[PDB]
Design a binder for this molecule. Structure first.
Ligand SMILES: [Mg+2]
Ligand SMILES: [Mg+2]
Ligand SMILES: [Mg+2]
Ligand SMILES: [Mg+2]
Ligand SMILES: [Mg+2]
Ligand SMILES: [Mg+2]
Lengths: 334, 333, 333, 338, 338
């Protein structure tokens, strides 16, 4: 049985985009029954179910299209590494889309499940919001192929779109690293340490996903049953290559960011050491001088030096000389 | 055959013989009453709680035909999760964990399972377990467990136990979120304590999960008296869970490894801010007190003491020097 | 053939020839009296203590037909645990450890075992070993060691030795617990030292256990004049133990790696506490002593000095500026 | 970006030219055109030719050439995408190779990377650079002045020659970096300033970027060393081994540096901490002799009446004596510290 | 120069000698020429011989010998390039081996490495050193006094004998290093000095260089232990195992040292940090008793009027009393902080 583990409740819509070599149709219903017929449609269809907290709908569709119910349980469990299972009817794919909110610097991950079946691609999102608008455009307009190709290319097209998003995400992150690696060693901030730890954390979650993502495309690139080897596989290679390019970049960032707090310590240590130097040069000229001026404010009666008309200047002289010898001796430090 | 554990006080035996049509249950402390079920034609769940009673483990081990090295393992609770297959029975060792809030430390009881014929033998240390879900489903004939044989019973138990780990990870994630906030506020020994505690717990946790993943890898691939027919896809579900779990723990370990480095960075800054204050104070008032110390030397012939635009003029120069200082603190604060 | 060790004073030889009914034992210092047992049709346990007597190692090595490179290894005690198989004898090198609390250090004696035909040769450095359990089972005819051949004898010895490591790890876990308190609550003079010592010991320990795991991996997989019929499942029990042990040591190393980082974090706190005190003191009394320094200036025309409601008004202003400060220090403390 | 098409991802606009160096044992000719058509014929030249296309932002030119020589268009898309790990793909006719050339800015201690793509086809080596600037002048000289044996050898040796040249460059880069490490690992023990920390972090970062390329570079030469189809095994493979060995030597060096540099900030912490501890020692010995002495001198400047000691007149000296003794006991007590 | 040619990359540019030791079970022929031509004949000797060429900066000599014995010229280029990881290449006529000998100066805490190249051919072991100085005297003194069984055995055992000698040297090196660690791990505990940190970093660095060599050394002996073409499997391979085992034993020991030394700076921080915290404690207890006491004594040196307490005949004592009490309260409050 079938519980949704996610946290996304409010949304529910269904997009259909049935398209053919000439002329492409598209609606948004909230009525699951209206979409089911496309199961049997002779040109490719992209049924996009947003809001799988509506588990009833996932059940109805899973049954009608003939998806083993363990798969439907996976689809609904969003805490899960990217993966690919092949079957007799259908390929089942689980992916993540990320979203990096600058400002408060945290990244959410929605989970997108794709099933390729017959001439359909089923898509299961958690909440409205996705990366796929490029693919909608290409269908609505035409811009190269996609119109001309079957549902396996549709799947290619979607998975490409999603992986291209990761590049945009990494750009945002590289940008944050550059900011951060400045804050640490020139212009620091209240929240620098926090952010540095945040960034580490995000990179972890990111890395944990990309390595598996590289597997799923490794699978879609070698053995490939109802994907037309004749055409589609070289495209799925293009995307596989991208995920390698991506996985490298993340290793780079993790590597780099691991040093930042160590830089930040070294900075603060400097900065503290400079504070202490100042305190010390001040303390170490004026404490003995105030001690001397403290002696000659003693109210003792056998105080011969107090008589001198030349004694007041001579202390000012010795107080000054002691101070000048000190400042010289601080041709080590400051 | 010695019991290495520390749990003495409990001893009971629960039987739950079930079929598609009826289920029996009882609790004896009389081992002889349970033995017959060895040959029962519908699945039985014999649950022996209190293995400090080694006599009972011996009697049962003999009757069911369990090689005595296995009975020695069953009794030794300091031990990594394991699976050994045999001709007649599968032997499995697992752990159940318990997160003590307060102490923030986690204890572990050891559960040994043997699947034999149409029986699942269960060997606990002490009363307390994670399996009540499975009891409910049998009692109230839920899901499909009544319809299925003893290998599904085993699936059902091992699933229940592995689901428990998710609950444990939730408690831990919750602590990490708390902690990773506490780390960058006021400096307190308690924070450091907890941080070290959390590291330690994640170690013990990791040391168990990796092996647990192996046992389910084994139950997913070779599979002799598990009906490949049906049961293996379920044991996959659980195997997948244990991967999901091991990934989470690697994530937490990774994350928590940084926390004391954050904490250092934070306290060090916080201290540096304290020193800044000491220094700005020390560095305006020490030279001012020095000036006021000069005038107040009890010297004879001190011309400035007499002049009466003099007391004001020092107050003036003392103030100006102080304002020059605060300006020069156009770097720090 | 030189003995690289440091242990000179001891030499004796124990023999324990046993059969399904009658066991003999003696202690000679006369090597010739033991040699005959080479041909004994029931298993014999010849235990040569004091291999600094290299003459004795030579004589025995020759008589039993042990390639002389092996005899050179036996005598070289600075060496990782090893197993070499030969056509007719297995050669095994192991370590026994000894942890002294107080002065927190561990020594390691090296034990070499050769299994040949119906003999187990044992080569110790000095009197002292872990094997007394095995002697008592042979003397009082316990378990089933009397019933079994010389390959089980070997099992029995290697098991005994590996079980010792568990006892060692308990002592070490106990030191960790002590230490991880000294770091968090209530430190001591030598904590940093000991922390480094413990790391070092865990290195030496780890350096042996990983190889020990290999030797038992070898004795578990291919295994030629070990009766596969019986003995191999026991050698598995020991192999499993050595994994359990290697995990535990990885656990300790993991844990102990954190200690100095905890200790820094605690010192950092502790320092930050100190600086806070220095600063609140410095920052109330420096400006107050400055004011009291002004009115001890010996200037003429100091109107306030003879404004009599002046001494009180300063005491008032000195107190007020102090109370404002203490308020401002419900941030820090 | 619909997947088929041909866009240049780099940042180098600005330059475009084409060098040809057709050589044989007896003559070589060379020219620089900006007219792609003039180069194409050399496809069928019976002696080896080195067509070097600088400025692949001109994607039109990459397309024209790719078509004429028969390069699957996915490869042409890779050639144009410069954010990419070194790699080797073999094909029926042509070997395709992607490499990086590095450039260490002193100043900004940072290192940029141009991407060089090489295709070996029949008796040609196609070279695709981003911008004018390369490491290959050694190979040009050897052709121009007929040195070593490159004139005698075919286009697969040309490829060897180029890849050797490029790999030798990395050694020069590592020298610059070793030199920086040696400097830095000294500077870490001197005064605390931020510039040190900066550089230390810069160096770590550079070694990361460096490591990211070398490990793949080692693979490409591993491939060129083992299976080798239109490389004459007779002759060329032992040379490609020489270069493979170099890249191992190189990768070891970088692992070495990363290993070493990982410690530097830890050294620097230990330095500054010491240095601070020495500052504090001075503050403390000063504060701890003069605070109690100023306190004594503060007592005897109290304006109290009935202050007997102020009178009885071996008194001023006796305080100076006790103030001095207290000070000398302090300095003695400070042969625990400094 | 082109890559093909023969340059010596090392820094040892003064020594040149050649030793020959052509031995049989009864006659052994040793001389030292600087004349390369006199040694070349021995290639054909039916009993084993050990030609030892010291000073490969004389590249002419390496060339002449390499040609006469038939050593592919890429190998001769490797022999001359001393910046290079230990390795083994097998050929149809000869095994080629590259090794390092190390030398640890205490005082100056640094280690030099000379590179030794060995070629085993027919019945002759060629040895190529950089400079006079080596570890092989044991092997000479077994051939000269006909000890062990080296006289009885062929040139493959000669090679065994040399490689064993060299590997045994590493044990002596590790003892010197263990000795430094012991010194250092004492010097960390007690002291804040500048040279300690330096040395600690130095030792890390040395253990890196050492580790970078031993892991490859383990490989070369792994190769000489397994496939072994005309190394007489009958006899020699069990000896080459003995040495292979040694190199594992050695590699462990350095992993041990690296492990151990990785902690030292962390110990050193923790010490200094404590040490500083103890300094600050003293400053603070002094500051925090005497600052408020000097403040009180500062009040009663105010030149005000009226100041009633100045007259009161118990004023001066009562402050001395209150100043003492406030001090004693402080010292008690400092049983928290030692
Ligand atoms: Mg006065
Ligand atoms: Mg489940
Ligand atoms: Mg650290
Ligand atoms: Mg414990
Ligand atoms: Mg694209
Ligand atoms: Mg070259």
């Amino acid at each position: 049985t079938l519980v949704y583990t996610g946290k996304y409740r409010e949304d529910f819509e269904i997009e259909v985009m049935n398209y053919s070599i000439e002329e492409f149709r598209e609606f948004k219903t909230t009525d699951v029954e209206s979409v089911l017929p496309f199961r049997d449609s002779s040109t490719p269809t992209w049924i996009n179910i947003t809001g799988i907290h509506r588990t009833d709908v996932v059940q109805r569709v899973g049954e009608f299209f003939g998806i083993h119910p363990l798969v439907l349980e996976r689809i609904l469990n969003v805490h899960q590494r990217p993966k690919v299972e092949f079957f007799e009817n259908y390929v089942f794919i689980v992916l993540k889309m990320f979203t990096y909110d600058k400002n408060l610097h945290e990244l959410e991950s929605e989970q997108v499940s794709l099933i390729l079946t017959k001439n359909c691609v089923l898509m299961f999102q958690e909440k409205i919001g996705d990366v796929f608008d490029p693919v909608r455009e290409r269908i609505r307009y035409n811009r190269g192929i996609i119109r001309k190709k079957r549902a396996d290319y549709l799947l290619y097209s979607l998975i490409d779109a999603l992986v291209d998003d990761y590049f945009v995400l990494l750009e945002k992150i590289d940008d944050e690293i550059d900011v951060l690696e400045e804050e640490v060693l020139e212009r620091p901030e209240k929240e620098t340490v926090q952010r540095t730890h945040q960034l580490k954390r995000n990179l972890v979650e990111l890395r944990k996903t990309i390595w598996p993502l590289r597997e799923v495309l490794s699978s879609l690139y070698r053995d490939v049953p109802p994907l037309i080897e004749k055409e589609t596989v070289p495209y799925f290679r293009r995307v596989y290559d991208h995920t390698i390019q991506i996985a490298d970049t993340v290793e780079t960032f993790r590597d780099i960011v691991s040093g930042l707090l160590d830089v930040y310590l070294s900075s603060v240590s400097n900065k503290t050491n400079e504070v202490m130097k100042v305190l010390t040069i001040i303390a170490t000229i004026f404490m003995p001088l105030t001690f001397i001026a403290g002696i000659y404010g003693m109210n003792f009666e056998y105080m011969p030096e107090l008589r001198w008309k030349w004694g007041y200047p001579v202390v000012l002289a010795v107080m000054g000389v002691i101070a000048v010898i000190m400042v010289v001796y601080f041709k080590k430090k400051k």
